[PDB]
Amino acid sequence: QKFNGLTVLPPLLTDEMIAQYTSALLAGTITSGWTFGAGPALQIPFPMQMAYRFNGIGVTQNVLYENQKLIANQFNSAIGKIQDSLSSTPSALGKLQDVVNQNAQALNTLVKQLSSNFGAISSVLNDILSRLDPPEAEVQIDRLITGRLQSLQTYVTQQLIRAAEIRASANLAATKMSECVLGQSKRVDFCG
Amino acid sequence: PMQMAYRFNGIGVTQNVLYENQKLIANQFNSAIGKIQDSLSSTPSALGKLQDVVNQNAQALNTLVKQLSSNFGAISSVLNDILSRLDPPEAEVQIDRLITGRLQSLQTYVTQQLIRAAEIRASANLAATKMSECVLGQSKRVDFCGKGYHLMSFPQSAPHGVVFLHVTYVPAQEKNFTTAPAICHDGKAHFPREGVFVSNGTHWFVTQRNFYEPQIITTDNTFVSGNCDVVIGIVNNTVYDPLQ
Amino acid sequence: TGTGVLTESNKKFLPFQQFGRDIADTTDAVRDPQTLEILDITPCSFGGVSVITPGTNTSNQVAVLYQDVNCTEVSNVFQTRAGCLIGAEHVNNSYECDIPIGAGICASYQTQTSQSIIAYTMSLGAENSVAYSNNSIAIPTNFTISVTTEILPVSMTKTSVDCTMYICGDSTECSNLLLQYGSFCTQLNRALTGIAVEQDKNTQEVFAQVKQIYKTPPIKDFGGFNFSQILPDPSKPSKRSPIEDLLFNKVTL
Amino acid sequence: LLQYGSFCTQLNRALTGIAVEQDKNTQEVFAQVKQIYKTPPIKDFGGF
Ligand SMILES: *[C@@H]1O[C@H](CO)[C@@H](O[C@@H]2O[C@H](CO)[C@@H](O)[C@H](O)[C@H]2NC(C)=O)[C@H](O)[C@H]1NC(C)=O
Ligand SMILES: *[C@@H]1O[C@H](CO)[C@@H](O[C@@H]2O[C@H](CO)[C@@H](O)[C@H](O)[C@H]2NC(C)=O)[C@H](O)[C@H]1NC(C)=O
Ligand SMILES: *[C@@H]1O[C@H](CO)[C@@H](O[C@@H]2O[C@H](CO)[C@@H](O)[C@H](O)[C@H]2NC(C)=O)[C@H](O)[C@H]1NC(C)=O
Ligand SMILES: *[C@@H]1O[C@H](CO)[C@@H](O[C@@H]2O[C@H](CO)[C@@H](O)[C@H](O)[C@H]2NC(C)=O)[C@H](O)[C@H]1NC(C)=O
Ligand SMILES: *[C@@H]1O[C@H](CO)[C@@H](O[C@@H]2O[C@H](CO)[C@@H](O)[C@H](O)[C@H]2NC(C)=O)[C@H](O)[C@H]1NC(C)=O
Ligand SMILES: *[C@@H]1O[C@H](CO)[C@@H](O)[C@H](O)[C@H]1NC(C)=O
Ligand SMILES: *[C@@H]1O[C@H](CO)[C@@H](O)[C@H](O)[C@H]1NC(C)=O
Ligand SMILES: *[C@@H]1O[C@H](CO)[C@@H](O)[C@H](O)[C@H]1NC(C)=O
Ligand SMILES: *[C@@H]1O[C@H](CO)[C@@H](O)[C@H](O)[C@H]1NC(C)=O
Ligand SMILES: *[C@@H]1O[C@H](CO)[C@@H](O)[C@H](O)[C@H]1NC(C)=O
C-alpha cells in the first residue's frame, strides 16, 4: 500500500542475503565446531566435535562413541519434531507476528487520524478553504495543523520506544548468536 | 609471566607453551599494543560511537534554542516587543501562543532526552559488565571480550566513555591431520584423557587441541573403556607402559 | 476533490454508491458522471531525494537517489530496486559495502578503476569451503596474540533547562499565564534532574569497581612484557597514559 | 506550517535514526562470519 506521505524503505540486507549468512554460520558450525568463531575454521569430524562438546558438559567422550548411533537417531528425531511442532502449534511465531501487527496498526491509526476535525468546521482542507474567507480559514486550518502535528509526534514517540525494545531484543539475539552458535555456553538456561 | 601462563591454561593450552616461547609472546604483545597507538592516530572515525553522543546532544540543544525564533502564530517572536506594543487584554492572547509552542517544544526535547538516556544507560550497564567480566576476570564467553580466545583486557578512559583493549589468543598456521577417536590394543579401546589423536602418516600421537604437541601414546595420557567392537572408527596401535 | 492519476478499474460498484473508499478512509475509486464508468484513483508519484557523496574532501562528484520512482520521469541512469539512482555507473563485480543504498545495493567512490561513484551488489565475504572429512582434523602449529579495541559510551552531558525563563524569561506578565498550566515545569525539571543524576551513576558503576587504589612497582620487571603504552606517564601534567592522551586529543566538542 | 519551526526536520530526523538503526540490528546479529562457508557435497556426518 502507498499513501499520503507514508513510505517504507527497503532493508539493506535482503532475505536472499540473510539466508546466506545463516548458511555460512551453519556450514562453519558443522564443519569446524567453534574454532571458526575464534580464528581460522579448523575442520574436525563431526562425531569428534560432538564428543568434545559432551566433554564440555562433564560427560566423558567414550559415552558419545559407545552410543553414537543412538545419539544421532535422537538428534534426527528431535530435529524432525521441530517442523511438526511449529507447523501445528499456532501463536508459536507470535513474537514475530506481533511486530508486524503493531507497526501496521500504528500506521493505520496515523492515517485514520486525518479523518478527525479537532474542532474545525470540516476535516477536508480544500472544503474549508473553498467556502471560508482567508482571515477565518486561517483559524480553522490552524486547529487541524495542531491536531495532525500532535498525532504525528505521538506516532514518532511510540516508534522510538518500540525501536528501543527491538534493539534490546536484537542485542540479545546477537549475544545468543555469538554465545550459543559460535561457542558452547556453560551458562544456565541461556541457550535452552 | 606466570599469571599469563595460567590464563593460557584457562583456554586449553598447557603452561609449557607460554614458558617455551615467552620471549616471542612478549614481543608479539608489545607489537600488538604498539599497533593500537598507530591505528588510533591514523584511522579517522575510530571514536565515532563517542563522537555521536556529543553530536546528538549538541543537535538537540541547538534545535531547542532555535525554537525560540518561532512565532507559533504570534505577531512577533520576541515577547518583549509584543508586550511593549500591546495592551494586556490583547497581549495575553499573543503570549499564550508562544507559551504553548515553547512548552511543547521543551516537552519534545525532554522526551527524546529520556529515551537517549535509557540507551546510554544500557551502554553503561554493558560497559560495567565488560569491566567486571573481561578486566576483573577472564571470560570463557565467546566474542564478548573480542575476537579469539580471551586472555585479558585493559581499560582506558575516554571522554564520556571507556575503551577496552582485549588481548586474545588467535590460532595460526595449521596442518591437515588424519585422526581416529580411539585406538585398539590387546582388545582394549583407549580414549584420550585430554586432546586428540593424530597421525603424521606412519606414527600416531596424542596432541592437545589448540597447539600441535605430539606425544607417544602411553597408558598415562589415555584411558581404556570398553572393547574394540563398539566404536566405529578405531585404529590398531601400540601403547607403552613405563613399567615394562 | 483531490489529485491523482485516474485509470480504468474492475471494481463492480453497486448502482447506488457514488465513490469507493479503501481501508483507513482513503478514496480508492469513484464512479464517473456522464458515463457511469468506474475509475480508479492512484496517488501520482512522489518520494524523497537522497544525495550520495564521497565527501567534499575527496571529490565534488555526487550520485542522487530518487527513492520510490520509476526511471521514466525526470549522465547515466540506473533503475534499482530501492529507487532510481542517477550518476552512478553499475559494475558487475561485487565489492564490500561502503555507502548503503538499500536492498543489497551499495555505492562508493572507487578512485582507482572508475573515477566515478560505482553502484554494485555488496559482497558478504570471501568464499572458502572447509575441507571436511570423516577422518581429518586441523590443529594450529602456532598462534598470534592479538589486541583489539572496543569503545563504549558511558555518560552524556548533564544539561538542565529552566522552563520559567526558557519560556518566559524576565516577564512576570507571562509567568502569571504560565502558572495556569500547572506542574508542567516541575515535571520537566524533575525529569532532567533524574537524567543528570543517573549520568553520574553510570560512571560510578563502570569505573568505581575497586575499593582501593593499586600502584605499580617502581621497577618494571615484567618478564619482557611492556606496558609503558598503557600506564600513566609521570612526565605528563595530568598523569594519563599515551593511549588515553590520544583518545582525549581525538574527540572534539 | 512554517511558523512552527523545525518540528518536522526533527521528526524526520528521529524516524531516519530508527530506520538507520534497524539495519545495524540486522548486521550485528547476522554478520558475524568473516567468510562464507560451504558444506561438502557428501553428507557423511557420522549419522547426523
Ligand atoms: C613420524 O614419527 C616418527 C617417530 O614417531 C618420526 O621418525 C623419526 O625420524 C627421525 C628422522 O629425522 C629419526 O631420527 C627418529 O629416530 C625417528 N623416530 C622413530 C621412533 O623412529 C618421523 O620422522 C615422523 N614423520 C613425520 C612426517 O612426522
Ligand atoms: C449525461 O448526458 C450525456 C449526454 O448529454 C450522456 O452521454 C451519452 O452517453 C451515451 C452512452 O449510452 C453515448 O452513446 C452518447 O454519445 C453520450 N452523449 C454525449 C453527448 O457524449 C450520459 O449518458 C448522460 N448520463 C446520465 C446519467 O444522464
Ligand atoms: C586440506 O585439504 C583440502 C582438501 O582435502 C584442501 O582443499 C583444497 O584447496 C585447494 C586450494 O588450493 C582447492 O583447489 C581444492 O579444491 C581443495 N580441495 C577440496 C576437496 O576442497 C586444503 O588446501 C588442505 N589444506 C592444507 C593446509 O593441507
Ligand atoms: C610463530 O609465529 C612467530 C610470529 O608470530 C614467528 O616468528 C617469526 O620468525 C621469523 C623467522 O623466520 C622472523 O623473521 C620473524 O620476525 C618472527 N616474528 C616475530 C613476530 O618475532 C615464528 O616463526 C612462528 N613459528 C611457527 C612454527 O609458526
Ligand atoms: C616499552 O616500550 C616503549 C615503546 O613501546 C619504550 O619506549 C621507548 O623508549 C626509548 C628510550 O630508549 C625511546 O627512544 C622511544 O621513543 C620510546 N618509545 C615510545 C613509543 O615512546 C620503552 O623503552 C619500553 N620499555 C621496556 C622495558 O621494554
Ligand atoms: C570414512 O569414509 C571412507 C570412505 O567412504 C569409508 O570407507 C569409511 O568407512 C568411513 N569411516 C571411517 C574411516 O571411520
Ligand atoms: C586390528 O587387529 C585385529 C585383530 O585381529 C584385526 O582383526 C583387524 O583387522 C586390525 N585392524 C586393521 C585395520 O587391520
Ligand atoms: C581533509 O582531510 C585532511 C586529511 O584527511 C585534513 O587534514 C583536512 O583538515 C580535511 N579538510 C577539512 C576537514 O576541511
Ligand atoms: C518501470 O516502467 C516500465 C515501463 O515504463 C515497466 O515495464 C517496469 O515494470 C517499471 N518498473 C517497476 C514497476 O518496477
Ligand atoms: C554484466 O553481466 C551480465 C550477465 O553476467 C551481462 O549480460 C552484462 O552484459 C554485463 N555488463 C557489463 C558492463 O559487464
JSON list of C-alpha atoms in Angstrom, two decimals, chain A residues 18-130:
[
{"chain": "A", "resi": 18, "resn": "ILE", "atom": "CA", "xyz": [20.48, -13.17, 5.30]},
{"chain": "A", "resi": 19, "resn": "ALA", "atom": "CA", "xyz": [19.92, -16.79, 4.31]},
{"chain": "A", "resi": 20, "resn": "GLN", "atom": "CA", "xyz": [23.49, -16.80, 3.01]},
{"chain": "A", "resi": 21, "resn": "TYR", "atom": "CA", "xyz": [24.73, -15.55, 6.38]},
{"chain": "A", "resi": 22, "resn": "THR", "atom": "CA", "xyz": [22.87, -18.31, 8.21]},
{"chain": "A", "resi": 23, "resn": "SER", "atom": "CA", "xyz": [24.14, -20.84, 5.67]},
{"chain": "A", "resi": 24, "resn": "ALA", "atom": "CA", "xyz": [27.67, -19.65, 6.41]},
{"chain": "A", "resi": 25, "resn": "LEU", "atom": "CA", "xyz": [27.09, -19.93, 10.15]},
{"chain": "A", "resi": 26, "resn": "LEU", "atom": "CA", "xyz": [25.70, -23.45, 9.77]},
{"chain": "A", "resi": 27, "resn": "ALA", "atom": "CA", "xyz": [28.43, -24.69, 7.41]},
{"chain": "A", "resi": 28, "resn": "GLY", "atom": "CA", "xyz": [31.00, -23.20, 9.75]},
{"chain": "A", "resi": 29, "resn": "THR", "atom": "CA", "xyz": [29.49, -24.89, 12.78]},
{"chain": "A", "resi": 30, "resn": "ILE", "atom": "CA", "xyz": [29.02, -28.36, 11.27]},
{"chain": "A", "resi": 31, "resn": "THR", "atom": "CA", "xyz": [32.41, -28.34, 9.54]},
{"chain": "A", "resi": 32, "resn": "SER", "atom": "CA", "xyz": [34.60, -26.66, 12.18]},
{"chain": "A", "resi": 33, "resn": "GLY", "atom": "CA", "xyz": [32.98, -26.62, 15.64]},
{"chain": "A", "resi": 34, "resn": "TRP", "atom": "CA", "xyz": [33.57, -23.36, 17.48]},
{"chain": "A", "resi": 35, "resn": "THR", "atom": "CA", "xyz": [37.05, -22.85, 16.03]},
{"chain": "A", "resi": 36, "resn": "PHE", "atom": "CA", "xyz": [35.82, -20.61, 13.20]},
{"chain": "A", "resi": 37, "resn": "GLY", "atom": "CA", "xyz": [34.48, -18.12, 15.74]},
{"chain": "A", "resi": 38, "resn": "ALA", "atom": "CA", "xyz": [37.92, -17.63, 17.26]},
{"chain": "A", "resi": 39, "resn": "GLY", "atom": "CA", "xyz": [40.29, -17.94, 14.32]},
{"chain": "A", "resi": 40, "resn": "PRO", "atom": "CA", "xyz": [40.56, -19.88, 11.08]},
{"chain": "A", "resi": 41, "resn": "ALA", "atom": "CA", "xyz": [37.96, -22.57, 10.61]},
{"chain": "A", "resi": 42, "resn": "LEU", "atom": "CA", "xyz": [39.60, -25.86, 11.56]},
{"chain": "A", "resi": 43, "resn": "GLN", "atom": "CA", "xyz": [37.82, -28.92, 10.22]},
{"chain": "A", "resi": 44, "resn": "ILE", "atom": "CA", "xyz": [37.05, -31.68, 12.70]},
{"chain": "A", "resi": 45, "resn": "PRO", "atom": "CA", "xyz": [34.98, -34.85, 12.16]},
{"chain": "A", "resi": 46, "resn": "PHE", "atom": "CA", "xyz": [31.50, -34.12, 13.44]},
{"chain": "A", "resi": 47, "resn": "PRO", "atom": "CA", "xyz": [31.16, -37.04, 15.88]},
{"chain": "A", "resi": 48, "resn": "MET", "atom": "CA", "xyz": [34.52, -36.00, 17.33]},
{"chain": "A", "resi": 49, "resn": "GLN", "atom": "CA", "xyz": [33.25, -32.43, 17.68]},
{"chain": "A", "resi": 50, "resn": "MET", "atom": "CA", "xyz": [30.15, -33.69, 19.45]},
{"chain": "A", "resi": 51, "resn": "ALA", "atom": "CA", "xyz": [32.41, -35.78, 21.69]},
{"chain": "A", "resi": 52, "resn": "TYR", "atom": "CA", "xyz": [34.27, -32.66, 22.73]},
{"chain": "A", "resi": 53, "resn": "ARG", "atom": "CA", "xyz": [31.00, -30.82, 23.33]},
{"chain": "A", "resi": 54, "resn": "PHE", "atom": "CA", "xyz": [29.98, -33.74, 25.55]},
{"chain": "A", "resi": 55, "resn": "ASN", "atom": "CA", "xyz": [33.35, -33.39, 27.26]},
{"chain": "A", "resi": 56, "resn": "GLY", "atom": "CA", "xyz": [32.39, -29.74, 27.72]},
{"chain": "A", "resi": 57, "resn": "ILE", "atom": "CA", "xyz": [29.46, -30.64, 29.99]},
{"chain": "A", "resi": 58, "resn": "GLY", "atom": "CA", "xyz": [31.22, -33.22, 32.16]},
{"chain": "A", "resi": 59, "resn": "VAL", "atom": "CA", "xyz": [30.45, -36.36, 30.16]},
{"chain": "A", "resi": 60, "resn": "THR", "atom": "CA", "xyz": [33.42, -38.43, 29.05]},
{"chain": "A", "resi": 61, "resn": "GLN", "atom": "CA", "xyz": [33.74, -38.71, 25.29]},
{"chain": "A", "resi": 62, "resn": "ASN", "atom": "CA", "xyz": [33.58, -42.50, 25.36]},
{"chain": "A", "resi": 63, "resn": "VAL", "atom": "CA", "xyz": [29.86, -42.10, 26.07]},
{"chain": "A", "resi": 64, "resn": "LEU", "atom": "CA", "xyz": [29.22, -40.48, 22.69]},
{"chain": "A", "resi": 65, "resn": "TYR", "atom": "CA", "xyz": [31.30, -43.04, 20.83]},
{"chain": "A", "resi": 66, "resn": "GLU", "atom": "CA", "xyz": [29.70, -46.03, 22.54]},
{"chain": "A", "resi": 67, "resn": "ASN", "atom": "CA", "xyz": [26.22, -44.73, 21.70]},
{"chain": "A", "resi": 68, "resn": "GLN", "atom": "CA", "xyz": [26.74, -42.59, 18.57]},
{"chain": "A", "resi": 69, "resn": "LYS", "atom": "CA", "xyz": [24.07, -44.41, 16.56]},
{"chain": "A", "resi": 70, "resn": "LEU", "atom": "CA", "xyz": [21.60, -43.77, 19.37]},
{"chain": "A", "resi": 71, "resn": "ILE", "atom": "CA", "xyz": [22.55, -40.11, 19.76]},
{"chain": "A", "resi": 72, "resn": "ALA", "atom": "CA", "xyz": [22.33, -39.48, 16.02]},
{"chain": "A", "resi": 73, "resn": "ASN", "atom": "CA", "xyz": [18.90, -41.11, 15.91]},
{"chain": "A", "resi": 74, "resn": "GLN", "atom": "CA", "xyz": [17.72, -39.00, 18.86]},
{"chain": "A", "resi": 75, "resn": "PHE", "atom": "CA", "xyz": [19.05, -35.82, 17.23]},
{"chain": "A", "resi": 76, "resn": "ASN", "atom": "CA", "xyz": [17.40, -36.62, 13.89]},
{"chain": "A", "resi": 77, "resn": "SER", "atom": "CA", "xyz": [14.09, -37.35, 15.62]},
{"chain": "A", "resi": 78, "resn": "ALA", "atom": "CA", "xyz": [14.27, -34.13, 17.64]},
{"chain": "A", "resi": 79, "resn": "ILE", "atom": "CA", "xyz": [15.05, -32.07, 14.53]},
{"chain": "A", "resi": 80, "resn": "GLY", "atom": "CA", "xyz": [12.17, -33.67, 12.66]},
{"chain": "A", "resi": 81, "resn": "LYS", "atom": "CA", "xyz": [9.83, -32.88, 15.53]},
{"chain": "A", "resi": 82, "resn": "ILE", "atom": "CA", "xyz": [10.57, -29.13, 15.25]},
{"chain": "A", "resi": 83, "resn": "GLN", "atom": "CA", "xyz": [8.96, -28.92, 11.81]},
{"chain": "A", "resi": 84, "resn": "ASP", "atom": "CA", "xyz": [5.72, -30.54, 13.02]},
{"chain": "A", "resi": 85, "resn": "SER", "atom": "CA", "xyz": [5.77, -28.67, 16.34]},
{"chain": "A", "resi": 86, "resn": "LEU", "atom": "CA", "xyz": [5.85, -25.17, 14.93]},
{"chain": "A", "resi": 87, "resn": "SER", "atom": "CA", "xyz": [3.69, -26.16, 11.95]},
{"chain": "A", "resi": 88, "resn": "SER", "atom": "CA", "xyz": [0.89, -27.42, 14.23]},
{"chain": "A", "resi": 89, "resn": "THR", "atom": "CA", "xyz": [1.14, -25.09, 17.24]},
{"chain": "A", "resi": 90, "resn": "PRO", "atom": "CA", "xyz": [-0.36, -21.66, 16.47]},
{"chain": "A", "resi": 91, "resn": "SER", "atom": "CA", "xyz": [0.99, -18.48, 18.07]},
{"chain": "A", "resi": 92, "resn": "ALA", "atom": "CA", "xyz": [4.40, -20.15, 18.01]},
{"chain": "A", "resi": 93, "resn": "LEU", "atom": "CA", "xyz": [5.77, -17.27, 15.91]},
{"chain": "A", "resi": 94, "resn": "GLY", "atom": "CA", "xyz": [3.75, -14.74, 17.90]},
{"chain": "A", "resi": 95, "resn": "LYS", "atom": "CA", "xyz": [6.78, -12.68, 18.89]},
{"chain": "A", "resi": 96, "resn": "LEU", "atom": "CA", "xyz": [7.46, -12.04, 15.20]},
{"chain": "A", "resi": 97, "resn": "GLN", "atom": "CA", "xyz": [3.84, -11.63, 14.12]},
{"chain": "A", "resi": 98, "resn": "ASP", "atom": "CA", "xyz": [3.34, -9.04, 16.86]},
{"chain": "A", "resi": 99, "resn": "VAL", "atom": "CA", "xyz": [5.96, -6.66, 15.48]},
{"chain": "A", "resi": 100, "resn": "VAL", "atom": "CA", "xyz": [4.28, -6.68, 12.07]},
{"chain": "A", "resi": 101, "resn": "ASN", "atom": "CA", "xyz": [0.85, -6.28, 13.66]},
{"chain": "A", "resi": 102, "resn": "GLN", "atom": "CA", "xyz": [1.94, -3.39, 15.88]},
{"chain": "A", "resi": 103, "resn": "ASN", "atom": "CA", "xyz": [3.68, -1.49, 13.09]},
{"chain": "A", "resi": 104, "resn": "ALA", "atom": "CA", "xyz": [0.70, -1.93, 10.75]},
{"chain": "A", "resi": 105, "resn": "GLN", "atom": "CA", "xyz": [-1.73, -0.86, 13.48]},
{"chain": "A", "resi": 106, "resn": "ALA", "atom": "CA", "xyz": [0.28, 2.26, 14.31]},
{"chain": "A", "resi": 107, "resn": "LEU", "atom": "CA", "xyz": [0.38, 3.27, 10.65]},
{"chain": "A", "resi": 108, "resn": "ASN", "atom": "CA", "xyz": [-3.36, 2.63, 10.28]},
{"chain": "A", "resi": 109, "resn": "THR", "atom": "CA", "xyz": [-4.06, 4.81, 13.32]},
{"chain": "A", "resi": 110, "resn": "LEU", "atom": "CA", "xyz": [-1.79, 7.55, 11.97]},
{"chain": "A", "resi": 111, "resn": "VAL", "atom": "CA", "xyz": [-3.64, 7.58, 8.65]},
{"chain": "A", "resi": 112, "resn": "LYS", "atom": "CA", "xyz": [-7.08, 7.39, 10.27]},
{"chain": "A", "resi": 113, "resn": "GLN", "atom": "CA", "xyz": [-6.14, 10.49, 12.26]},
{"chain": "A", "resi": 114, "resn": "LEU", "atom": "CA", "xyz": [-6.62, 12.51, 9.07]},
{"chain": "A", "resi": 115, "resn": "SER", "atom": "CA", "xyz": [-10.38, 11.99, 9.38]},
{"chain": "A", "resi": 116, "resn": "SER", "atom": "CA", "xyz": [-10.61, 13.98, 12.63]},
{"chain": "A", "resi": 117, "resn": "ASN", "atom": "CA", "xyz": [-11.97, 17.52, 12.82]},
{"chain": "A", "resi": 118, "resn": "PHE", "atom": "CA", "xyz": [-10.18, 18.63, 16.02]},
{"chain": "A", "resi": 119, "resn": "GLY", "atom": "CA", "xyz": [-12.94, 21.25, 16.22]},
{"chain": "A", "resi": 120, "resn": "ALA", "atom": "CA", "xyz": [-12.66, 22.55, 12.66]},
{"chain": "A", "resi": 121, "resn": "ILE", "atom": "CA", "xyz": [-15.82, 23.03, 10.62]},
{"chain": "A", "resi": 122, "resn": "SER", "atom": "CA", "xyz": [-14.67, 20.20, 8.34]},
{"chain": "A", "resi": 123, "resn": "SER", "atom": "CA", "xyz": [-11.71, 17.86, 8.13]},
{"chain": "A", "resi": 124, "resn": "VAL", "atom": "CA", "xyz": [-11.10, 18.48, 4.41]},
{"chain": "A", "resi": 125, "resn": "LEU", "atom": "CA", "xyz": [-8.69, 21.38, 3.98]},
{"chain": "A", "resi": 126, "resn": "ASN", "atom": "CA", "xyz": [-9.90, 22.15, 0.46]},
{"chain": "A", "resi": 127, "resn": "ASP", "atom": "CA", "xyz": [-13.53, 22.04, 1.58]},
{"chain": "A", "resi": 128, "resn": "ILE", "atom": "CA", "xyz": [-12.96, 24.54, 4.38]},
{"chain": "A", "resi": 129, "resn": "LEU", "atom": "CA", "xyz": [-10.77, 26.74, 2.17]},
{"chain": "A", "resi": 130, "resn": "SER", "atom": "CA", "xyz": [-13.30, 26.80, -0.66]}
]
